[PDB]
């Protein structure tokens, strides 16, 4: 029963409440216990409680005396219990409660008036119960109640009388999910004082019942309406007619298996701002299908269209000018679809669009013709996502229409070509370009000469070729900050590849083959490709096969903080190499061949660190080579994980395995 300010007793197998806790405890948690009964006599000591979570237990019934000992209680949680009986005195003395959870209590019927005696209640939960009617009392109470949950019940109708108790209550959420409701009575929602949101997830309504619901929702203050998994197979221009008289802003139609969308179906939602259509089965989207939605600010179409079938090849076709009505659209999530391709008028009309995601949106977008994004000429796009589209070729002037583009995501594709440099024309405001996980890329002298504003360039596992050209391909990128060149099997790097990149901060070169470039036997001398990077912060050189470190590689990294050198073949290091690393924070040298750690090389490096990884190193336990290192280990504040588990000497056999 650990407790400093709140009390936790979760999964402690308690049968009775403890009697030794501070008097001024505010939270008392007893989830996942076996409290058969909860006598109130044990609560005399605990008279300062605010939250009382006694859920996931086996309490049969409570007593009103429990509320007497708690004068300031605000939270009462009784999830998954057997409290199937309620009385007027059960919650009589409790009046400051702002939360009441009764989920999965097997409550059958609300008898007379269990919730009259409280007026400050905010949230009430009755999910997973056996209730058949929404009647919670005879008179009107629950003045401040804002959220009411009735999901997973056995309610089959919503009569007007049963909600007469909410004639002056502002309901911000009326959860009625998983209830087989098949009849709606007139005035059922008009009787509610102020209904702001309705949730009917997993409720088998159907199109006609949905229309009846919308008609019953006319001339009310609803703002949200979730109809997820409602078996809404088909919509028409009259399905949402009843919403013409309201100001609905959020509508959810996910998992409804919406086979087709009718013409002018959503013309009755001029105030809609958030529309959801994810995980549907739409086979055809008409030009006027999205008519009347000129105020939507966020549209989701993830898996909204039908998948390909070899039987008929029923690829979901999108008609031209289908998105012309979304004038105020600002976010279009359109991932995991099977569209045949992009047309010249697919995205016409989106004059306020700022985010388009097309991750795996097309079956085969092999070639990015310069006329592909012509429909996005007037769209002020900022972020474009094109991952998992199986793109195989990008022609010149492909992105010449996205003048406002800032982030381009072309990763996780099969792009195999030579970057002539004309593919990036028109990206005057580009900031980040992602190209990782491609087939193979062949850089040229002027590959990135048309995008001087670029700041991020990720090329992880792309099999870079001709990166060792005499003019550095990264020279025009004066504002580059993050560069990733990992898993490219790079062999040759020129010393001037990173020349002029003063603002570079994060550089990744792990999983490459640069061992030869740093050995002293390399013809032409070692390659010092890390000169001039005064602002470099993070360096990654894992699995490079390095066997020798030149003395003056890190001679100018005055602001280096994180350096990675794990999974290498380092055995000896030059003296006085980390002198300029005055602000080093993390040093990684795991899975290396280092046998000696001396102050002459690791002195300045161990000045003020916060992490250290030298686990799988065959250390040599000798006072000439390890005594200083173990002495530094003894007294330090740097975090060294698995210090006593893997920091084991290998030689001599006298100290074989001794930490």
């Amino acid at each position, epitope marked *: 029963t650990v407790s400093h300010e709140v009390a936790d007793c979760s999964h402690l197998k308690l049968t009775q409440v403890p009697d030794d806790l501070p008097t001024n405890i505010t939270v008392l948690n007893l989830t996942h216990n076996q409290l058969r009964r909860l006598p109130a006599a044990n609560f005399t000591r605990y008279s300062q409680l605010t939250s009382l979570d006694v859920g996931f237990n086996t309490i049969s019934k409570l007593e009103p005396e429990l509320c007497q000992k708690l004068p300031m209680l605000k939270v009462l949680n009784l999830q998954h219990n057997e409290l199937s009986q309620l*009385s*007027d*005195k059960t919650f009589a003395f409790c009046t400051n409660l702002t939360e009441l959870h009764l989920m999965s209590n097997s409550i059958q019927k609300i*008898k*007379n*008036n269990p919730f*009259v*005696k409280q007026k400050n209640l905010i949230t009430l939960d009755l999910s997973h119960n056996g209730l058949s009617s929404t009647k919670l009392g005879t*008179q*009107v*109470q629950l003045e401040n109640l804002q959220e009411l949950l009735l999901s997973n019940n056995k309610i089959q109708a919503l009569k*007007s*009388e049963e909600l*007469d*108790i909410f*004639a002056n209550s502002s309901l911000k959420k009326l959860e009625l999910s998983s209830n087989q409701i098949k009849e709606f009575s007139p005035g059922c929602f008009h*009787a509610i004082g102020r209904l702001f949101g309705l949730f009917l997830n997993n409720v088998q309504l159907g199109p006609s019942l949905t229309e009846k619901l919308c008609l019953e929702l006319a001339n009310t203050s609803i703002r949200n309406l979730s109809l997820s998994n409602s078996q809404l197979s088909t919509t028409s221009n009259t399905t949402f007619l009843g919403l013409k008289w309201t100001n609905l802003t959020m509508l959810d139609l996910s998992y409804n298996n919406l086979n087709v969308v009718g013409n002018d179906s959503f013309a009755w939602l001029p105030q809609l701002e958030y529309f959801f259509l994810e995980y549907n089965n739409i086979q055809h989207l008409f030009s006027h299908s999205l008519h009347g939605l000129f105020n939507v600010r966020y549209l989701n179409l993830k898996r909204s269209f039908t998948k390909q079938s070899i039987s008929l090849a029923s690829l979901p076709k999108i008609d031209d000018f289908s998105f012309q009505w979304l004038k105020c659209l600002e976010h279009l999530n359109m991932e995991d679809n099977d569209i045949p391709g992009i047309k010249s008028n697919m995205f016409t009309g989106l004059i306020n669009l700022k985010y388009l995601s097309l991750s795996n949106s097309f079956t085969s977008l092999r070639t990015l013709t310069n006329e592909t994004f012509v429909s996005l000429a007037h769209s002020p796009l900022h972020i474009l996502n094109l991952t998992k589209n199986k793109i195989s070729k990008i022609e010149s002037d492909a992105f010449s229409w996205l003048g406002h583009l800032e982030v381009l995501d072309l990763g996780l594709n099969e792009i195999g070509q030579e970057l002539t440099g004309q593919e990036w024309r028109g990206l005057e405001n580009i900031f980040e370009i992602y190209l990782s996980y491609n087939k193979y890329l062949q850089l040229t002298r002027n590959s990135f000469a048309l995008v001087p504003s670029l700041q991020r360039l990720m090329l992880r596992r792309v099999a870079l070729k001709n990166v060792d050209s005499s003019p550095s391909p990264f020279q025009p990128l004066r504002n580059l900050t993050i560069l990733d060149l990992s898993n490219n099997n790079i062999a040759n790097i020129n010393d001037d590849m990173l020349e002029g990149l003063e603002k570079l901060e994060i550089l990744d070169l792990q999983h490459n083959n640069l061992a030869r470039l740093w050995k002293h036997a390399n013809p032409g001398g070692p390659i010092y490709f890390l000169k001039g990077l005064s602002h470099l912060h993070i360096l990654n050189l894992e699995s490079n096969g390095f066997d020798e470190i030149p003395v003056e590689v890190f001679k100018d990294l005055f602001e280096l903080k994180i350096i990675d050198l794990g999974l290498n073949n380092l055995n000896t290091l030059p003296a006085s190499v980390f002198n300029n690393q005055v602000s080093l924070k993390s040093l990684n040298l795991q899975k290396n061949l280092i046998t000696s750690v001396e102050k002459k090389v690791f002195g300045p490096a161990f000045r003020n660190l916060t992490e250290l990884d030298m686990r799988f190193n065959p250390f040599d336990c000798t006072c000439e080579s390890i005594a200083w290192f173990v002495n530094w280990i003894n007294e330090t504040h740097t975090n060294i994980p698995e210090l006593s588990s893997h920091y084991l000497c290998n030689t001599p056999p006298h100290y074989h395995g001794f930490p």
Partner: single-chain antibody
Amino acid sequence: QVQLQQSGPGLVKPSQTLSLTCAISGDSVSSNSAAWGWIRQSPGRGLEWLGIIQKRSKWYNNYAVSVKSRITINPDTSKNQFSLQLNSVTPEDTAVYYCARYSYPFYSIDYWGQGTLVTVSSSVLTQPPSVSVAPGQTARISCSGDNIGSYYVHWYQQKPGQAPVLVIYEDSERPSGIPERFSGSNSGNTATLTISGTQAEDEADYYCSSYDDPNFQVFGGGTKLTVL
């Protein structure tokens, strides 16, 4: 405060309609903080709830199954009244009819009509029938039943020729104006009205009553208290 004035014939021929009117002053018949109802009392029995109506969203009425097929309680919003229409009367309908205000939230009755005696001619709460007490001696009136441990118990006092007076509500609460010597308790399936030092003015009939889920209101048989 609230005045309820009843009016109507005190004599009805059999098989006719018994019509009475309760006129409200100092309150509204459409009030969302009260309910308006009729109960009756014959000397061969105690108190019997007949019907009730309350203005919440639409007009809702609840009737006792004994007279459900005959009774009718309609409000007159234009005149701030409510009526009582009991068809097919029979000398078994001869009784004193009271109109009353049920005060939320306990449905205890704080205001009664003067009562109209009507003659027709051409759950169980159990109380001891009688309790005799000396002046200054504490009186204890018990009330047993299954509603005791499941509902609040109200206690009413009725002097001869007068409407009942609520002396205790919600098993122990005492309305203002009632002497402090009155108190109530509820232990198990037995409620108890204790009159500490019964005075001569406390000699009356005491009825225990409670709310009830199917039948709305249930009254005890009544206990005659005598100050010797």
